[PDB]
């Protein structure tokens, strides 16, 4: 998780819809957290199966 | 597993047995035809359903019939 979350924020921060706003970094972090939640759901249901 | 049936129009030509790629069929003694043998399918668990046996059968209509059914690893021809 430490390895992946660090680089995942970059695409969102630098290329997301709000990249040119002054809250672009915060939006990138929020997008990264959302992606991590999606991946964690994947891991959870994978383990269950 | 697929179903393979032999009907009594079989003339014991052994062509379906030679055509089978997975050795499902074999010739067995029988007094119903001149050749003195009939086809048999004792190993339908290995039948892939290619229908080469039906392509090989000379009777009209076919004497060997393959009905496709429940798929397994063996019937799907999977190497994995």
């Amino acid at each position: 998780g430490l390895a992946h979350g660090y680089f995942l924020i970059g695409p969102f921060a630098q290329l997301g819809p709000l990249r040119n706003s002054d809250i672009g970094l915060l939006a990138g972090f929020l997008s990264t957290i959302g992606l991590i939640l999606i991946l964690t759901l994947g891991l959870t249901i994978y383990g269950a199966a | 597993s697929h179903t393979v049936k032999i009907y009594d129009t079989c003339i014991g030509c052994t062509q379906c047995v030679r055509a089978c790629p997975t050795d499902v069929l074999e010739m067995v003694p029988w007094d119903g035809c001149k050749s003195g043998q009939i086809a048999s399918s004792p190993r339908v668990e290995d039948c892939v359903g290619c229908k080469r046996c039906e392509t090989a059968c000379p009777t009209d209509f076919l004497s060997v019939r393959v009905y496709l059914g429940a798929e397994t690893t063996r019937s799907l021809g999977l190497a994995y």
Binding site: - | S1, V44, E45, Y67, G69
Partner: protein, 122 residues
């Protein structure tokens, strides 16, 4: 060695459109759905090979082999009924004469009259 080991699987044949388990069984008795690779020092499943310092290729290590003795013995075990039939039609000691004189595979391959001919020699 049990002969119905293949048949003793969990495959329950359906009531229609299903040839069932034939001469050896419709499927393996072993559940193929096992875990993926595992860290150094751990096994993914019960009989898995320890990939040593390369567990990521652990599945490329073979734990299933066929040694020639097992091959001969299972050849004899699986064809015991066919040999019993051939001696029943040709006619204990006589079978031991035939299968050592010419061979076991040859004894299966020959015919009852032909074996009646080779039994002429002693």
């Amino acid at each position: 060695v049990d002969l119905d080991y293949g048949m003793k699987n969990s495959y329950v044949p359906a009531t229609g459109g299903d040839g069932g388990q034939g001469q050896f069984g419709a499927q393996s008795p072993n559940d193929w759905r096992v875990a993926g690779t595992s860290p150094v020092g751990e096994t993914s499943y019960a009989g898995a090979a320890d990939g040593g310092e390369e567990p990521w290729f652990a599945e490329a290590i073979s734990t299933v082999s066929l040694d020639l003795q097992k091959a001969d013995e299972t050849l004899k075990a699986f064809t015991k009924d066919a040999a019993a039939f051939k001696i029943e039609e040709f006619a204990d000691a006589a079978m031991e004469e035939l299968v050592g004189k010419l061979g076991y595979s040859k004894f299966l391959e020959m015919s009852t009259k032909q074996l009646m001919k080779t039994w002429g020699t002693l």
